[PDB]
Each structure stands twice: as structure tokens, then as C-alpha cells.
Amino acid sequence: PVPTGGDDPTKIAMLGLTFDDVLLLPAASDVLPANADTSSQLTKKIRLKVPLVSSAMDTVTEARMAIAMARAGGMGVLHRNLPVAEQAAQVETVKRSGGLLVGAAVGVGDDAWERAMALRDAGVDVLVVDTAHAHNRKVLDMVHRLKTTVGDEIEVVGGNVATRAAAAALVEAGADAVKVGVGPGSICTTRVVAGVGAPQITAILEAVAACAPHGVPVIADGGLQYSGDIAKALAAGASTAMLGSLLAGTAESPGELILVNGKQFKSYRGMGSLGAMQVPEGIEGRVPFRGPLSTVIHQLVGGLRAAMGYTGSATIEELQQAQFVQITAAGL
Amino acid sequence: PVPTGGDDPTKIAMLGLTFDDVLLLPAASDVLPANADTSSQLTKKIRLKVPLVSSAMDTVTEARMAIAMARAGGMGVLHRNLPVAEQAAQVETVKRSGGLLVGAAVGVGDDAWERAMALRDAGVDVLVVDTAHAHNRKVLDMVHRLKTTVGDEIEVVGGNVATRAAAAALVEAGADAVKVGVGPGSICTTRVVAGVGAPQITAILEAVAACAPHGVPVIADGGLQYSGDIAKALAAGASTAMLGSLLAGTAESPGELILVNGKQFKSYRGMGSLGAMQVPEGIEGRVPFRGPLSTVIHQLVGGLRAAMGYTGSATIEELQQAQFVQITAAGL
Amino acid sequence: PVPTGGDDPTKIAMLGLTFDDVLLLPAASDVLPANADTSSQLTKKIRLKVPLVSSAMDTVTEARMAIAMARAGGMGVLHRNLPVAEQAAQVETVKRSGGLLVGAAVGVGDDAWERAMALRDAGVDVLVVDTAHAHNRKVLDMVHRLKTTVGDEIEVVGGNVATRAAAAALVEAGADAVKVGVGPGSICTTRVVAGVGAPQITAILEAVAACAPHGVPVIADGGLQYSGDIAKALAAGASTAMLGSLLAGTAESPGELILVNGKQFKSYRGMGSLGAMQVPEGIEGRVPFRGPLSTVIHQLVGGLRAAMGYTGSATIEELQQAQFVQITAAGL
Amino acid sequence: PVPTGGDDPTKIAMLGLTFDDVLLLPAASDVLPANADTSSQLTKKIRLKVPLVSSAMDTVTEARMAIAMARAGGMGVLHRNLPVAEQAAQVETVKRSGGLLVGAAVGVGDDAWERAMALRDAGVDVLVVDTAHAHNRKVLDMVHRLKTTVGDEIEVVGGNVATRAAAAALVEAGADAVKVGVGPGSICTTRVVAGVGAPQITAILEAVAACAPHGVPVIADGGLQYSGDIAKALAAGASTAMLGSLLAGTAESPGELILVNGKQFKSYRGMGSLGAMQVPEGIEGRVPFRGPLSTVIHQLVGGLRAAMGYTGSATIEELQQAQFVQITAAGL
Ligand SMILES: O=C(C1CCCCC1)N1CCN(S(=O)(=O)c2cccc3cnccc23)CC1
Ligand SMILES: O=C(C1CCCCC1)N1CCN(S(=O)(=O)c2cccc3cnccc23)CC1
Ligand SMILES: O=C(C1CCCCC1)N1CCN(S(=O)(=O)c2cccc3cnccc23)CC1
Ligand SMILES: O=C(C1CCCCC1)N1CCN(S(=O)(=O)c2cccc3cnccc23)CC1
Ligand SMILES: O=c1[nH]cnc2c1ncn2[C@@H]1O[C@H](COP(=O)(O)O)[C@@H](O)[C@H]1O
Ligand SMILES: O=c1[nH]cnc2c1ncn2[C@@H]1O[C@H](COP(=O)(O)O)[C@@H](O)[C@H]1O
Ligand SMILES: O=c1[nH]cnc2c1ncn2[C@@H]1O[C@H](COP(=O)(O)O)[C@@H](O)[C@H]1O
Ligand SMILES: O=c1[nH]cnc2c1ncn2[C@@H]1O[C@H](COP(=O)(O)O)[C@@H](O)[C@H]1O
């Protein structure tokens, strides 16, 4: 019998590693952190100066965040928990502030196609087909329909996935980037409510095995707690990281300042929380107030630059080839 | 020598996984959670609408709980810590409330046979031969005697087991379902008192390897803390889950409301606790008050439906074929 | 290279398991706990009714404890942190209370031989050559000299060891029992002071591999926190367990009652603590007051009997053949 | 696919062990702790009486610490966070106190060469090329230039490294000792800021595999919390240990006494902390006040002597050949 039970070796398919399970190994380097090139592909056509995008959540990204992210060299993805006209108006607002990149989330419901076209009319650069489980005919069809209809002018992101097969299906459907993360978010309760999830280092490694041979970039979405996790996500093969919790405490995020026990916080809630939907798969929580976005991004990029120095990675493409050491429980 | 000591590779027979050690992997899906079929075999003949049964404990299941469980599409198993006439009267009470399924626990003591016949006379549908260790001639004989005597009209459950050999012995004795769980209960101290136990994912996988080829359903009993654990238990191959702690805080469970530190609780105690027996293998504890049973069951089934959506499982039989990823300590 | 570093596979010699790493697996059983035979060899010639002996520590075993242990069916080992005449007087005191077995500790210093002879004159049954590291010529010589001089009338225990080679050396020197435990004691700081130790399940398995083929019993000494650990120690192949912390809180142990924060305690200190020696390898601590020894022993034996029921072990010799499942961090 | 994800077995290059992951196994011994020889090579030419050196940090080592360390039989490495003239004056101060060994840190900036020559003029014995990542042409060139210019009179240490390849490069450049530790320091945030690091037992094992065949000693730098960790570091193959946190609380370290909550502390800060640089990779913290250095060193050496007794190591060279057992999470 299999050592963990039963007679089927495939029943437990893999050992899933998360960010805390690994560290980047130093390697021969003549790269100064200040001189590293942090640019990376968000999609097949769109390259960002900083490999970071903000989550499509209503306590993270509206027009103010999207503008600040683009100015910092990344991009915002506008959330879709609002009327079509209002989302498209936020797209226009971002475009009014110069030649700034912006993305926007759409679902696969019956209002989704109309939402997508209105966003297109407003001048959006990236449409994100925004689901918790992309390995589904309705999601794949939406990605494909969008790519064939507006694909010349707009890049189409599909997600989320956590397996190689799912990433492969999105590639076949025509996705310009594949977003990875089922279960890892800081406000996520999918693991305890549904018992479903996939540790994010292993999910990225698997998704990249399907996407990289087709020249399709992977966006690592969820579970990033520290700037060092961004370096780990990219070294596992992702091309960008999408951040929720790490940006939710910034001045530019939606929501007001909250004072509890003499300390400052902002509300941060899952799009699957009871509040956002009003069976919940997210919580409503708090994150410490962090000040201006520009400063948070500077600290995050700073940690990434340090990782590039330690690993001898002159570019993000080189960082994607770095090696890990796996650590034990004691290592934490 | 064996890496963990000695010269005998069989001394440490297996690596035992519990619920927290695994997550369900998403798979290709065209299943909507609302449309998933949650029905499953409790026994060879009896199929439930919801794959959940309440524990035969005196702080979990008497007539009120049994009626509410059956109305919710599951079933109650009436505890046996009371006189024969009173248990049989609870069976009659459940039957007075319509065509509701009900089960009842019996032991293997010398009063057990008389208890079983009185329950039969009262119209019980399921007899549960209710022990902490079923791999024992007296237990196997009781299962067999019951099956040969009342088996045409009543389904006979045997338990508990934690090994493949034990499950196989119950199958041979004629059990209509095999109940799995030695040591995993939330109020259990068997692990620290006797040093005995078996992590429940591995126990289910092993029991199912003996039971499934004979068409005998497995009931996963104990250690379930979250709705996601129900999905994991079924994916490991169980057909139903038996719940104690998760239902002990409901309005329909026996016992009164307790207020401590401004919060509401109900008493929840092991049938092996000093109180229930009045060498203890259970504690007397508290669980948070949860409100009506119907609402708890709705939340639990909701999480199960989400898991079925993520895994592409249209039925419980399909969910039994889902795959796991094993996670590390950091993953918790 | 070796996965954990370097080029030498023997540098990290084994994976060491402690009690918390394993559980006993249930097995086919027709053993009632009340009818199990708990007798076991303390030494080649001496069989105890209960397989438990009290530690040779000055907060655990003086005459009162030794008498109570023998009456309970086990044995006490009198500590040696006192003058020779006083230790021998405690031996006489135990013998005055009927035909009770008693042991006594000796070191390997230059006063050790005289201590041993005085204990012999006083009628001791067991001499324990009592060291932290028995794999040493001076210790082996002391064991051998004792066995050749007083071996017809007195059984000679040697310890402590944690490796197969060390246990083998004691067997060759003529030990009648081998005591296992380097580093596992509850009050031990050897692991953090010296960085030395050996997880106790693996140490027992290794020692037993050297001792059992020569008919020499193993005493598991240290690290036992629960009655279930006694069952685990014996199933790993030990014949008896030596208890310090679990007995230090009893009425019969030396020392007075201590009240802190409204709760009752007794002092419990390592023989390697600064206080006992007045570079420390033990701490001075507290254990909860537990009441009479007889009651503690009854609870401990109760847990052992339960384990024998679950595993189908009619005797301690059968329990030594039981199997384990290894558990994960989540299992704790 | 690889069990942890992707198709590349080299992506996760190793399983990294830290000090808490292992224990030293006892072995046959006729070594008394008091008689063990604790001397060891700091560099190819310089042997210390005690195998300990103090960190080049401005809350650990200035002239007072360096003098006390040398008197205790070890050595201090003077920090370089001060003007060249002042560092060289501290070297002179140490030399004024007798024939005491002293080292001093230099960087690889454009002021580094002038700093090195001024230290040479002041009579320093050891120059430590002091970086966070030595596998870099500028660092290797500095080591080589120093060795070829002042190598007859001064020993040249290079560091830090965490891989076999990096240690090999320093050996080739002419280093007289290689210092190991990237990420393990108690005040380090490199692991969370950059996601970079290497568990220290594995790092030492790897570095030693490159250095020992060339007769180059390894200094284990960082992560040592207990005296037992010193024994583990040396048994992994290091020849000396460099201590920061363990010495930062001593009377001889720079800084004043701090009283918080009725207890005494001293400030201890990373050289990568915001305070020391005024993207931080260290924190500013506190350590308990420990009293005189001589006493701390005596306790540390005491633990080392105990380890040498347990392992039968008469010399540090013998201790370098000792074996480990790997422990589990439960073992902690
Ligand atoms: O559509 C579903 C699933 C229902 C069950 C069957 C599969 C689909 N939702 C479940 C909850 N999410 S969410 O807001 O919590 C969510 C949104 C973005 C990404 C996430 C990744 N992992 C976990 C949750 C995620 C939104 C809707
Ligand atoms: O009959 C026994 C054993 C005595 C020792 C030898 C084997 C049988 N009992 C032990 C305690 N249990 S219990 O109430 O705690 C209990 C009841 C349902 C299932 C459980 C599963 N695992 C653990 C305990 C369980 C009832 C009686
Ligand atoms: O003789 C020694 C060692 C000194 C270093 C070299 C090897 C021998 N002692 C060390 C401390 N112990 S102790 O009291 O702490 C002690 C006593 C019984 C058993 C124990 C098992 N593991 C750990 C400590 C133990 C007594 C003397
Ligand atoms: O030069 C660098 C790196 C910048 C990023 C690219 C590689 C080099 N520094 C980073 C921080 N350190 S430190 O003070 O924190 C430091 C100093 C001694 C040893 C250490 C070992 N591990 C971690 C930190 C260490 C000083 C400068
Ligand atoms: O309610 C929720 N439950 C689970 N995941 C969510 C929810 N809302 C958003 N997410 C995902 O979690 C990401 C943010 O993760 P974080 O950066 O760890 O906080 C988001 O980009 C989503 O992919
Ligand atoms: O006293 C006890 N000790 C150990 N297990 C018990 C005891 N009483 C009931 N059980 C079992 O634990 C199950 C409930 O587990 P729970 O849902 O985790 O609380 C019950 O259905 C029994 O199988
Ligand atoms: O000071 C000490 N340091 C380490 N081990 C000790 C010391 N004193 C006694 N021991 C051992 O620890 C055993 C008791 O362990 P315990 O039952 O876990 O408390 C004793 O029988 C000794 O073998
Ligand atoms: O700011 C820092 N961040 C990371 N490592 C540092 C820093 N400052 C000094 N170190 C290293 O950590 C060692 C001290 O580690 P410790 O003994 O565990 O406190 C020092 O000798 C340095 O190698």
C-alpha cells in the first residue's frame, strides 16, 4: 500500500509548497540592486516597469489606486463590484490622467459581455476574466470570445488556476496571461469552507510548466505577505505578482481610516465575504495603515532588487531561473 | 537499519495524514454548486439526501435532534446512555413525526441484544453497533447475529475501525456500513491516555480499500472541525460523515445554554468522559452556541457544494474520485 | 551531494522520533483491559507486577516513595545525592516494611565502590550504575566489576545510553538491564547546553535491537509525559519505564507542598541543576501536586491496560510487538 | 513531474537544515569535559585557545570587547562603522594591552583599500573582508589583492557565503578562512525582505565540502542561540563560531544598560538596520544583560566541553567528525 494510505499513488497527487517553505539561494553575482532591471511582461504584449499589479477588490483598486499604480510603473485592475457605467467611468478617469495603463475585471455572468464592451469603449488596456476557478467551459469561452473580438486592441487575462491542466486550457483558449491562485489569499476561507486549495509555490511551478513553453506570462495572485514573497513568486517562474493585502492599507486604496487600540487600520475584505456579496469564502478584516502607495511600492521593489543582487539576476527573466532551498518547520 | 530506528521496516507501518494535512485540488468543472447532487449511501440500502449523520452522544442526539436531522435530509443516531425503554420511546417519537429515518446505538454487553430487539419493535431503520474498537470477536458476532436475525428490515452499521484489516472483518461479518474513527474526536483523550490512534484521512483511505470493493459504504466519524473537512472525508472515499462537535452547539442538541464571559455555549462531553460514565478517554467541554440545526446544516452543505463545484464533482460518487495535495506545516 | 548538505550520507545518521511522533495502531483483539497481564522484566531475573520504576532523583525517590512503588507492584530506585550511610539506611527502611523490592543508584567515582558494597550489606536487590553517558570504559568496568563480585545476589543495571553501539557495550559488560535516555527528560537542558540528544522512540528501537537478542531488558528513562507514552515506550520494545516528572508531584515524593497563584505544586529539579549540584544540564522547576502515588499509578496502569486492549496485547511481551503509525505536525 | 511542482528536479536544490533540526549523537568516549582541548584554527595560520570570535557589529565589538575576547582565548573583530582613523586607533588600543590577537572588518568600497592599509599599519593580525554576499568579483578581487600585498604578515578572511560554489571561489581567491552565513542572524530580515537565505547547518556542510579539502577553516557566522549550537556548528565542520546576539548583552559590548519592565537589557542592532545605516535587512532590538564577557564565555565553553565529552571528541578536529540525528517538529 501507499505509505499514506490506500493503494492509489495518485490519490495524493503532489506535495504543495507555499512561500514560507522555501528561500532563494544566493548565486554568483555582479548585479548591483540599484542597477537591476525590474521590468517584466504583464501579458504577451504589455511590459511593466515594476512587476506588480493591484487586486481587483473593492477595498484595494478604484481609480485613485489604478492611477498611482501606473505612475509607480505597475498597473491597477479595477474591481467589478459596481454598475457597468461606474466601472467604465473609472477607466475614463484613469485615462484622463495621462497615458496610463489600466485593467478592469469582468465576470462570466450574462452582464459580463456588456460590461466588457463598455470597458473597451472607455479605452481599457487589459480585460481580466476574473473568477475563482477558470477551468470551466463558460470561463474558457469568455476568454476566447474576447480574444477573437477585441484581441487586437486589448490584452485578455484569464484566471484563476492552480493546476497545470487548468493553465494549459486557458493557454489554448487564447489567454494573453494566466493568473494563479486558488485558496492562498490572506482573507480567504476557501480552504476551511470548501477544503480546496493549492499551495502557491507549487501552483506557480505547475502553471509555469504549461504557460512558459507558449510564451504566456503567469501572474501570481494571493498569499504574498512580505516583499521577499514577490521575489520567490517570480523565481518560481511568475512574471508579475498581484497584491491585495499588501496594498489595502495604503492612502490610495478605497475606504476610510480606522482607529482601534490607538493604532491606525483600514478595512480589507474578501470579494467572497458576506459584506462584499451584500456561502462566504472570504472574511472582512483589517490591515495596518501604511501611508502613500508610492512608498509601499518603493519598499517592495527594494526587497526585490536585493533578491536580484543576491541571486545575480540582472533581469526578471534571469530571476525566473534562480534556485530554492526548502526549509523545515524549525526554519520558521 | 531503518532510518527511524531498529531493523524492522514494518514497525512504523504508515505515515498517517489527518484533515489538516491535505487540500482538495481543483479540477475541470462544469458543475454549479447549487446543482450538485449531495445524496449518498448511508448503508448498502439507505441513501440520504445530505451525507451527514449526528453522533450517538448524549450531548448531541436525542429525539429532537434526530427529527431535525431527518428533516434536513440526513439522519440522527440516538445515543444509548439511558434505559432501553427510554431509547425505544425516542425511536417511536421520531416515527410519530412522519416517515423519518432514524438510527440507534447498541453495545455488545449482555443487555445489548434486548436493547436491539426493543429498538426493532419500535421501528428503528438503522442499528449501529457502537464500540471504540470493532476488531473483536464479540463485536463481529453481534453484527453478524443482528444481520442474520433482523437484516431484511433493518440496516446494521458496525464500528469503529481505523485499519484495513478491521474494516475487512466487519465486511465479512455482514455489516451494511463501516464506521471509521479511532482516536480523532474533538473531545477524545484516547491518544494521550492509551497512546492509540489513527489519523483520519489515512484511516478512511485504508478502510475504503477494504469496503469499496464489496459495495459497503464508509462513515467517517470524528475529527471534523470545518465544513471543508466533510468534503475531504468524502473525497478520501467515505460516503457519509458523522458529526459530534459541529452539531453539539445547536438548539436541537440536548442540554441548556451556558453563559461564560458574555458568550453563549453548550456543554459537549465524550461518552468516555467521567461524567458520561457516571479510566476516562474523553473530556467534558464546551462548544459555542450555533443556533438552529437547519442553519448549521445549510452552511455545512454549502461548503460541500462549493467543493463539488471546484472539483467538477456532479455527485458524491464523483467527489470520491477527487485528488489531494499534501501540505506542509507552513501551509497551516 | 546529500540533499541536506555535504557529500557524506552518514553525517546525519538517522531521523529520530519522539513519543509525540507516533501512535499505536489498533489490532485484532480479544483482550479485556481489566484482564491484561501488566507484568514485565525489570532485569534478567526480576519481574515486576507493574512495569514502572521511579527515578533516582532527590525530588522523586527516597524511602517513602520506594516503599509505595513496591507496594503498587513496581520499584523505586533510591537517589545517591546523600552520604553512603544515609542511602544504605534508606535501603534498610524499605526492607523493614516487608519483602519489598528496592534499587539504589551508584556512580563511578572513587566513592562509588564503597557505596555499592554498603548498599549490598543493607540488602538492596538492584544496583543502578547511574550515569548520563554509559558508553565509557569507567562505566563499563564498574558494571562488570559489580556483576562479577555481587552478581549472584544483586541485579546490575547500566545506563544511560541512546545508541545501539552503547547498549551493545553494556550487554557485553554484563548488564542485567540497559537504561535508555540521553537528553529526553522533562527538566533536561542537555539538548540546549551541549546540543546532544536522541529522540526517545528511536533510541529505544536502537537499544532494543542490541539488547533483545541477548535477553537483556530495556528500561525507557525520560520524556514520558502521559500514560499513553508508557504504552508507546513498551511497544517500541522497552520492558519497563522509569518515571520522574509523572511521580514528582505525588504525596510520597520528597519535598513540601508549594502554593502559587492559588494552585498546589511540588518542586521538581534535575540532578544536573545548579541546586542539586550545590555547567548545569537540568533546571529547577515545579509540577502540579497529584495526590497519593497509588492513585497516579492506578491511572497510568489504566491507560496502559487500555492500550493493551486496543492492540490485542495479552501481555507486555505481546505489546512489544505492536505497530505504530507516524503522524505529522498537524496531528498534534 | 517533480513532487513539489514543475519538471525540473534542480529547481529546489536541497533541503536546508538549521541548528534546531539536529542533535549530536553520543559516541564511545573516554574524554572528560575538563580535559578536552578546545583550541581550533581561526585561519590557516592562527589557532585560538577557544573557538569563538565576536561579530564585527557596533553593538558588539569595539576595543573593550576585543581585549576581553583575546584574554578569554578567542578574538574580536572590530566593526567598520566609523572613520578609518578611529578603527585603527582601536587596533592600537588592543595592542597596547599586551600580545593580544585582534581582527578588523573592511568592505569593498573605494575607501576599503585605504582602511585596510591603515589597519595594517596599526598592527592588525586579521583582516575580514566583510560583506553580505562574497560570491562577487569585487569581493574576490579584494581578498586576492590583500593576500598578495599583505598576506605574509596578515591573515585574510572572506565572507559571507552560503553555498559550496561561493566558498570554492573564496578559496581560489586566496582566503585564509571562509565565513558562512547568509540570512541566519538573530536580527536579520534578509529572509523576509529579499526572500533569500540558507539554513546554517546545511550551509556549513556545503562550505566545508569546498574548504576542508584545501585546508581552509570555516567560521560559522550567525544563528547561534545556545551554547549547544556552537557544538553543532563545529560538528558540521566549522572551525570557529562568530557570535553576535550571545555577546551583545555583555558588559564589554558597546552601549548602555536599558531598563524595561524591571529587567535589564542592552541594545542590539543589525548593521543593516535603519539606525546603523543612518532598504533595511536588519532590525534594532534588545538582548538581556548578561554580565561580564568572561562569564558568558565560560558558560559557552562549558557547554562545548560537555558536547566533547558526550561525543568522545578529544579535540575540535575530532568533534568535526561527530554525527547528527535529525529531529522532527515534535522534538522541539
Ligand atoms: O465562483 C466561485 C466558486 C464557487 C464554488 C465553485 C467554484 C467557483 N466563488 C467562490 C468565492 N469567490 S472569492 O471571492 O472568494 C475569490 C475571488 C477571486 C479569487 C479566489 C481564489 N481562491 C478562492 C476564492 C477566490 C468568488 C465566487
Ligand atoms: O471500550 C472501550 C475501549 C477500552 C480499551 C480497549 C479497547 C476498547 N472504550 C474506551 C472509551 N470509549 S469512548 O467513549 O471514549 C469512544 C466511543 C466511540 C468511539 C471512540 C473512538 N475512539 C476513541 C474512543 C471512542 C468507550 C469505551
Ligand atoms: O556526567 C555528565 C556528562 C558531562 C558531559 C560529558 C558526558 C557526561 N553529567 C551531565 C549532567 N548529568 S544529569 O544530571 O543532567 C543526567 C542524569 C541522568 C541522566 C541524564 C540523561 N541525559 C542528560 C543528563 C542526565 C549528570 C552529569
Ligand atoms: O550588500 C548587501 C546586499 C544587498 C543586496 C544584494 C547583495 C548584497 N547588504 C545587505 C544588508 N547587509 S547586512 O548588514 O544586513 C549583513 C551583514 C553581514 C552579513 C549578513 C548576512 N546575511 C544577511 C545580511 C548581512 C549589508 C549590505
Ligand atoms: O473573498 C475572497 N476569498 C478568497 N480569495 C479572495 C477573496 N477576495 C479576493 N481574493 C483573492 O485574494 C487575492 C488577494 O490576496 P492577498 O494579497 O493575500 O490578500 C486577490 O487578488 C483574489 O485573488
Ligand atoms: O469520550 C470519547 N472519547 C473519544 N471519542 C469519543 C468519545 N465520545 C464520542 N466519541 C467519538 O467522537 C465522535 C465525535 O467527534 P467530533 O465530531 O470530532 O466531536 C463521536 O461520534 C465518537 O465516535
Ligand atoms: O538534570 C538533569 N538533566 C537531564 N536529565 C536528568 C536530570 N536529572 C535526571 N535526569 C534524567 O531524566 C529522567 C526523568 O525524566 P522525566 O520523567 O521526563 O522528568 C530521570 O530519570 C534522569 O534519567
Ligand atoms: O542587519 C543585519 N541583517 C542580517 N545579518 C546581520 C546584520 N548585521 C550583522 N549581521 C550578521 O549576523 C551575525 C550575528 O548573528 P547572531 O549571532 O545570530 O545575532 C553577524 O556576525 C552578521 O554576519
What does the DSSP 8-state code read for residue D271? T
Crossing angle of helices A84-95/A63-71, nearest 10°?
30
Q: How many CB atoms lie within 10 A of CB B231?
A: 30
Between CA D219 and CA D204 the distance in angstroms is: 9
Between CA B302 and CA B31 the distance in angstroms is: 14
Cβ proximity of C201 and C21 under 8 Å: yes
Between CA B272 and CA B276 the distance in angstroms is: 6
Between CA D43 and CA D147 the distance in angstroms is: 13
Cβ proximity of A302 and A36 under 8 Å: no
The sheet that has D12-16: what strands, in order across it?
A22-24, A324-327, D12-16
Between CA C75 and CA C124 the distance in angstroms is: 12
Distance from CA of B202 to the nearest CA of C (A): 10
Q: Which chain D residue lies closest to A226 (C-alpha atoms)?
A: D192
Question: Ligand 1 — pocket residues by CB below 6 A?
Answer: A 132-133, 160, 181-183, 185, 188, 190, 270-272, 281-282; B 33, 306, 309-310
Angstrom distances, CA of residue C82 to CA of A143, B44, C269, C277: 84, 70, 15, 11
Report the nearest atom of ligand 6 relative to the CA of B243.
Answer: 17
**Which residue do the cell numbers 461564560 mark?**
B260
Distance from CA of C210 to the nearest CA of D (A): 15
Closest by Cα among B138, B144, B168 to B156 = B144
Q: Do A3 and B14 touch (CB under 8 A)?
A: yes
- Name subunits touching D (3+ CB pairs < 8 A): A, C
What does the DSSP 8-state code read for residue C103? E
User: Is residue A211 annotated as part of the catalytic site, yes or no?
Assistant: no
Cell of B93: 417519537
Between CA B63 and CA B46 the distance in angstroms is: 20
What are the two backbone dihedrals, phi and then psi, of residue A2, each rounded to the nearest 5 degrees? Answer: -60, 140
Residue B55 CA to ligand 6 centre (angstroms): 8
Cell of C28: 485484532
- Please state whether the peptide bond connecting residue B136 to the residue before it is cis, i.e. omega within 30 degrees of 0: no
Strands (E), chain D: 12-16, 22-24, 40-41, 47-48, 52-54, 75-78, 103-106, 126-130, 155-161, 177-180, 218-221, 240-243, 257-260, 263-269, 284-288, 324-327
Strands (E), C132-223: 155-161, 177-180, 218-221
CA triplet A137, A43, B310: central angle to 5 degrees?
30
- Please state whether the peptide bond connecting residue C160 to the residue before it is cis, i.e. omega within 30 degrees of 0: yes
- In this structure, chain A runs to a length of 332
Convert C232-269 into a string of H (helix), E (strand) and C (coil).
HHHHCCCCEEEECHHHHCECCCCCCEEEECCEEEEEEE
Q: Do A306 and D161 touch (CB under 8 A)?
A: no
Cell of D85: 582613523
Beta bridge partners of B15: C326
Q: Which domains does chain D have, with CATH numbers?
A: 1-332 (3.20.20.70)
D174 is in an annotated binding site: no
A176 lines ligand 5 (CB under 6 A): no
Cell of D45: 595560520
**How far does chain A reach from its first CA to its final CA, in angstroms?**
33
CA C34 to chain centre: 25
Type of residue at C201: I
Cell of D278: 543612518
Convert chain B into a string of H (helix), E (strand) and C (coil).
CCCCCCCCCCCEEEEECCHHHEEECCCCCCCCHHHCCCCEECCCCCEECCCEEECCCCCCCCHHHHHHHHHCCCEEEECCCCCHHHHHHHHHHHHCCCCCCCEEEECCCCCHHHHHHHHHHCCCCEEEEECCCCCCHHHHHHHHHHHHHHCCCCEEEEEEECCHHHHHHHHHHCCCEEEECCCCCCCECHHHHCCECCCHHHHHHHHHHHHHHHCCCEEEECCCCCHHHHHHHHHCCCCEEEECHHHHCECCCCCCEEEECCEEEEEEECCCCHHHHCCCCECEEEEECCECHHHHHHHHHHHHHHHHHHHCCCCHHHHCCCCEEEECHHHC
B253 lines ligand 6 (CB under 6 A): no
Between CA A258 and CA A268 the distance in angstroms is: 11
Between CA C238 and CA C167 the distance in angstroms is: 13
CA pseudo-torsion sign D138, D144, D148, D153: positive
Cβ proximity of B25 and B324 under 8 Å: yes
CA triplet A86, A87, A93: central angle to 5 degrees?
85
Which residues in A lie closer than 8 A to residue D199 (C-beta atoms)?
Answer: 23, 325, 327-328, 331
Closest by Cα among B221, B205, B220, B226 to B326 = B205
Closest by Cα among A127, A204, A218, A126 to A170 = A218
Cell of A207: 502553471
What are the two backbone dihedrals, phi and then psi, of residue D8, each rounded to the nearest 5 degrees? Answer: -110, 105
Residue C185 CA to ligand 7 centre (angstroms): 4
Report the nearest atom of ligand 1 relative to the CA of B308.
Answer: 6
**Bridge-based pairing state of the strands B240-243 and B52-54:** parallel
Crossing angle of helices A84-95/A112-121, nearest 10°?
20
Cβ proximity of C59 and C79 under 8 Å: no
Q: What technique determined this structure?
A: X-ray
Q: Do B307 and A21 touch (CB under 8 A)?
A: no
Q: How many CB atoms lie within 10 A of CB A153?
A: 10
Report the nearest atom of ligand 5 relative to the CA of A184.
Answer: 18
D253 lines ligand 8 (CB under 6 A): no
Between CA A192 and CA A283 the distance in angstroms is: 12
Closest by Cα among B243, B247, B254 to B59 = B254
Between CA A174 and CA C51 the distance in angstroms is: 71
Distance from CA of A225 to the nearest CA of D (A): 9
Closest by Cα among D117, D126, D122, D124 to D47 = D126
What are the two backbone dihedrals, phi and then psi, of residue D215, each rounded to the nearest 5 degrees? Answer: 70, 25
Cell of B99: 416517515
- Out of C5, C135, C199, name the one closest to residue D27 (CB): C135
What does the DSSP 8-state code read for residue D16? E
Between CA D43 and CA D169 the distance in angstroms is: 17
Cβ proximity of A181 and A221 under 8 Å: yes
To what resolution in angstroms was this structure determined? 1.6
Cβ proximity of D178 and D161 under 8 Å: yes
Q: Do D182 and A230 touch (CB under 8 A)?
A: no
CA triplet B138, B141, B143: central angle to 5 degrees?
110
Helix residue ranges per DSSP H, D129-226: 137-150, 164-173, 190-193, 200-211
A310 lines ligand 4 (CB under 6 A): yes
What does the DSSP 8-state code read for residue C25? P
- Please state whether the peptide bond connecting residue D261 to the residue before it is cis, i.e. omega within 30 degrees of 0: no
What are the two backbone dihedrals, phi and then psi, of residue C149, each rounded to the nearest 5 degrees? Answer: -95, -45
Cell of D50: 577557544
Q: Do A202 and D16 touch (CB under 8 A)?
A: no
Closest by Cα among C177, C165, C312 to C239 = C177
Beta bridge partners of A291: A250
What are the two backbone dihedrals, phi and then psi, of residue C136, each rounded to the nearest 5 degrees? Answer: -160, 135
Cβ proximity of C196 and C190 under 8 Å: yes
Cell of D266: 542592552
What does the DSSP 8-state code read for residue A330? G
Residue among B55, B128, B131 to mutate when testing ligand 2 (max atoms within 8 A of CB): B131
Between CA D76 and CA D53 the distance in angstroms is: 5
**Bridge-based pairing state of the strands D177-180 and D218-221:** parallel
Closest by Cα among A19, A42, A31, A39 to A235 = A19
What are the two backbone dihedrals, phi and then psi, of residue B53, each rounded to the nearest 5 degrees? Answer: -130, 145
Cβ proximity of D80 and D113 under 8 Å: no
B273 lines ligand 2 (CB under 6 A): no
Report the nearest atom of ligand 8 relative to the CA of D222.
Answer: 15
Q: Do C303 and B194 touch (CB under 8 A)?
A: yes
Residue among A81, A130, A157, A281 to mutate when testing ligand 1 (max atoms within 8 A of CB): A281
Between CA D57 and CA D80 the distance in angstroms is: 8
**Bridge-based pairing state of the strands B75-78 and B52-54:** parallel
Breaks (C-N over 2.5 A) in chain D follow: 278
